[PDB]
Amino acid sequence: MTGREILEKLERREFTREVLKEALSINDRGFNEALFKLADEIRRKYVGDEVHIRAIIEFSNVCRKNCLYCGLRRDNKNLKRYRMTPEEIVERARLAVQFGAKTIVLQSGEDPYXMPDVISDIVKEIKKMGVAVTLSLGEWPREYYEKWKEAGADRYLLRHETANPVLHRKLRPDTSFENRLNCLLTLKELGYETGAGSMVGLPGQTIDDLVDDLLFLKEHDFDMVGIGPFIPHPDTPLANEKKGDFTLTLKMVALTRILLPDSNIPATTAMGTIVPGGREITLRCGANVIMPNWTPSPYRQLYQLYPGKICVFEKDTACIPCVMKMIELLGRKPGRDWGGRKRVFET
Ligand SMILES: Nc1ncnc2c1ncn2[C@@H]1O[C@H](CSCC[C@H](N)C(=O)O)[C@@H](O)[C@H]1O
Ligand code: SF4
Ligand SMILES: [Cl-]
Ligand SMILES: [Cl-]
Ligand SMILES: [Cl-]
Ligand SMILES: [S]
């Protein structure tokens, strides 16, 4: 259909595969700008002008898995590995809460050392501070997820990466889409606010695959959706592949907001890495969350999922203040509470 008719169907919520495919395939500037405006307006209406700050501590870059896209993959010998101590992680979290963070995100490689009991201990200590805790630790047994929920964790981020099971298995050779989905379903059953999401522009990924990602997210009605471009890392098998396209990734964020109007959607660091000011653009095209880096030196520079990451040369405490300034210059407001999903039940 024409751009105008696709927009009209999106506005009427005729979210057919055909409508989504055409939205992603049309490259017209006028169409794209209208799509972004629609997503921005839906964001404003459903989740308001508050931008929720989640302070992320990347506490270990040790990983047992070998994902082909990721700089932390176990086969990468050209990376200094680190582990923050439990005391360092708790005190770093406390500093974030002192700086006004209402959610602490603990993220790592799949590092066996902490699992499950050290994480449980850390979660309990951080929960005493009266903030939300979000974990992003990869795939672990149900029993671990259960222990972490009992310890007080509120949310879990586990991007589905790609909903194409063949592509998923090739890129993530230790595991599968079936396992990734079962993990996400387990997290939901246990009562976590659950986050999924995907990379855009993976080698071999098609527009139809992106449509499938959108339909998968809509199907499962995730609380959070993290989306960013694939960024090749020189010490991985995908070193020589093309980076994901910023505008296409932005369209995926916009469509995610249109499909899941009451969800929490970050403006990811990868978006700010491939285009200067990319996070700010993304916050104006459907996103309502930002995750300032709170990993301390000397470790911040060693958590290299992809190269060139912004935030690496700034001081340990710079990023929360940075995003507060950002929020103000965008004409937005910081989140007032923990920024949990506020469902708007509809038809
Ligand atoms: N090269 C790369 N380019 C863009 N994003 C990447 C990337 N490598 C990894 N990521 C993204 O970073 C996210 C965090 S990975 C860290 C958490 C955990 N090990 C897990 O795998 O879930 C991933 O879900 C993935 O989407
Ligand atoms: S994406 Fe997560 S599980 Fe895969 S190699 Fe990177 S850190 Fe390890
Ligand atoms: Cl979160
Ligand atoms: Cl994310
Ligand atoms: Cl990212
Ligand atoms: S930062």
From Swiss-Prot:
Residues where [4Fe-4S] cluster binds: 63, 67, 70
Record Pfam families: Radical_SAM
Assembly information from the UniProt record: Monomer.
Classification via PANTHER family: 3-METHYLORNITHINE SYNTHASE (PTHR43726), BIOTIN SYNTHASE (PTHR43726:SF1)
Record's protein name: [FeFe] hydrogenase maturase subunit HydE
GO molecular function: 2 iron, 2 sulfur cluster binding; 4 iron, 4 sulfur cluster binding; metal ion binding; oxidoreductase activity; transferase activity
Family indicated by similarity: Belongs to the radical SAM superfamily. HydE family.
Superkingdom of origin organism: Bacteria
Residues binding [2Fe-2S] cluster, per UniProt: 311, 319, 322
